[PDB]
Design a protein around this ligand. Sequence first.
Ligand SMILES: CCOC(=O)N[C@@H](CC(C)C)C(=O)N[C@@H](CC(C)C)C(=O)N[C@@H](CC1CCCCC1)[C@@H](O)[C@@H](O)CC(C)C
Ligand SMILES: CCOC(=O)N[C@@H](CC(C)C)C(=O)N[C@@H](CC(C)C)C(=O)N[C@@H](CC1CCCCC1)[C@@H](O)[C@@H](O)CC(C)C
Lengths: 326, 326
Amino acid sequence: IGDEPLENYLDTEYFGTIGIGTPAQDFTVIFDTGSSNLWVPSVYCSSLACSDHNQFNPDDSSTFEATSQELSITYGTGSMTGILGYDTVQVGGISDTNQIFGLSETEPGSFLYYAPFDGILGLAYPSISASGATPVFDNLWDQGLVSQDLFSVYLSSNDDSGSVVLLGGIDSSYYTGSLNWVPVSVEGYWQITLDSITMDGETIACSGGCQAIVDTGTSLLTGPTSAIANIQSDIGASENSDGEMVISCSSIDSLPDIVFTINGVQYPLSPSAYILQDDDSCTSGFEGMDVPTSSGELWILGDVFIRQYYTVFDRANNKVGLAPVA
Amino acid sequence: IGDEPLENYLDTEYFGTIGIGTPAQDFTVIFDTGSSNLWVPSVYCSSLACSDHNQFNPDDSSTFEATSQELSITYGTGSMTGILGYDTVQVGGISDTNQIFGLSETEPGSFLYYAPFDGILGLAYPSISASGATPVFDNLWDQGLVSQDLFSVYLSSNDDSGSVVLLGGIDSSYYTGSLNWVPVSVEGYWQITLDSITMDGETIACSGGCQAIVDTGTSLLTGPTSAIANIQSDIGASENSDGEMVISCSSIDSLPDIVFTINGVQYPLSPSAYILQDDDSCTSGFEGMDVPTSSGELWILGDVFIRQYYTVFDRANNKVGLAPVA
Ligand SMILES: CCOC(=O)N[C@@H](CC(C)C)C(=O)N[C@@H](CC(C)C)C(=O)N[C@@H](CC1CCCCC1)[C@@H](O)[C@@H](O)CC(C)C
Ligand SMILES: CCOC(=O)N[C@@H](CC(C)C)C(=O)N[C@@H](CC(C)C)C(=O)N[C@@H](CC1CCCCC1)[C@@H](O)[C@@H](O)CC(C)C
């Protein structure tokens, strides 16, 4: 079981440290369950986002193996094109040997240039892995490096220390009562079926269910624009400049829980979970984002939700396990 | 003995993580031996750099005690003014109970905005601490949270993992041979007497001594403008724009050791250590700054130097211990 400590930056991005190579070059990465690929900046990248960011030099690793397999990936925020090579990756105190990972050649856009992390470590299923590159957890299970075929995430609140990715195990100290398991409906993302979303008993969205992914890599709780636009009204948040659906911080103590019913069990987010507040200003935890898939237009249950529910991702049986954090 | 790992960001910045408060809030701080104050942003800070960095909120800490004292600190690059407060800083494993530190109120200048860290933990002598704020090492020793009255720094080269600050102990495995102990000359900074800087038999600089400090929070080897000017010429580096006193990377195999004799022992610097090379670009490790003190113009032996020499800063007997990295 590996323990990968995570830095909670503004409750928006949780990232940890990995080493790639021999000797090991260090990089901080986002641990993303919305994707399956590991990749970091390389000395071959010309994009501006690579200049101010730690870059992987293959000519300094006695263990590196090159391949000619090119790679291309687009996220909701940012993309990269690169090439796939091979090496040891130290992640969560484990020596992942012979891991295929992406070395970037371009990271188009201004977004990532600003970001306090170098790369992305995907944790979704191999089916969505661009260029078929073996996911890290997959390569660990395959090598017998993790004791169990599950990892779990605890994401801290209020910029506190202690967020963790526990690879190969759960730790009951992080949750209250017991885990509820939900089947993955469609296996690629950790896609689970959302039964409904209510406030004060009335369905306000997702009537007759909708598809949801549990994404550690999304900050907010994102959903199909039109739906979210309602919720925003149902809590009185309004637009400021570029996505700032601003809400008065006085409102927090008046609003009601918004309940997510997944597999018959209700998972409420209180107003103090779904309103993010910096110092003296509040914002909405909900973001509109149409993400069309073959299995429907997704509802992404980001850090805003994961912050309240210790999440376990069982690959052995394709189930998500949720329980309230301690 | 505290073990504090630092992320080597581009061989220019080495920062680690601390927690302030119960429950503890995360912050990444530069461990700077060139000052003595610990500060972090706080929710009082209005400044630009304070918006995109984590901010200490006293209201979410059950162990916070506030003070009336004001704090102002000008650094070589940057500054702050703030208010002082007390709380439990968990640094390197240790829970430094009831520690005074600065909650900033302004952090003027866009460079701090763009920087991948929140605060600075100063590691020098109390004489130079702003407002006579107890430096953390001092507060650990007074409470007996460290065994030995010394700390050691190992700074990895090449963006590798493994840079570490070892609080209250030296670790033999990081150096070659045995420590050479230099006395501190004047006690404020970790100030020592540099006897000469020669290059192929000839004194290129600082004949008949000059004052130097070993300063982990300074990226390059710094010295008085006019002196460094000659060294830049003698190695070939020339300005491009906002410095970028750039050198043809081809020159790394022609150039010789510049040598720093400290208390009669010679400490050479290979081209490989004094020309910085990100990617396929080599720039010069020397920077020209006139740093007037009551004990002369200071030479700063920063990161460029410390990456080649494991350094013990011993407060028990006012002495610095150097030995080559193994
Ligand atoms: C206040 C707004 O917050 C953000 O923009 N946050 C970023 C991530 C932050 C950790 C830097 C985000 O949520 N981006 C989403 C965009 C989403 C709302 C459409 C995203 O692309 N997340 C990536 C992961 C991110 C990519 C940017 C770098 C960090 C990892 C991945 O999970 C998805 O592409 C999965 C797909 C099913 C939607
Ligand atoms: C390649 C260019 O690199 C830098 O300019 N690096 C910065 C530090 C980096 C961590 C941003 C530097 O060397 N800053 C020196 C600049 C000075 C040599 C012209 C400095 O102010 N360092 C601070 C600590 C820094 C200050 C900015 C915040 C990070 C800690 C401290 O050591 C001095 O105040 C000591 C004094 C005797 C000069």
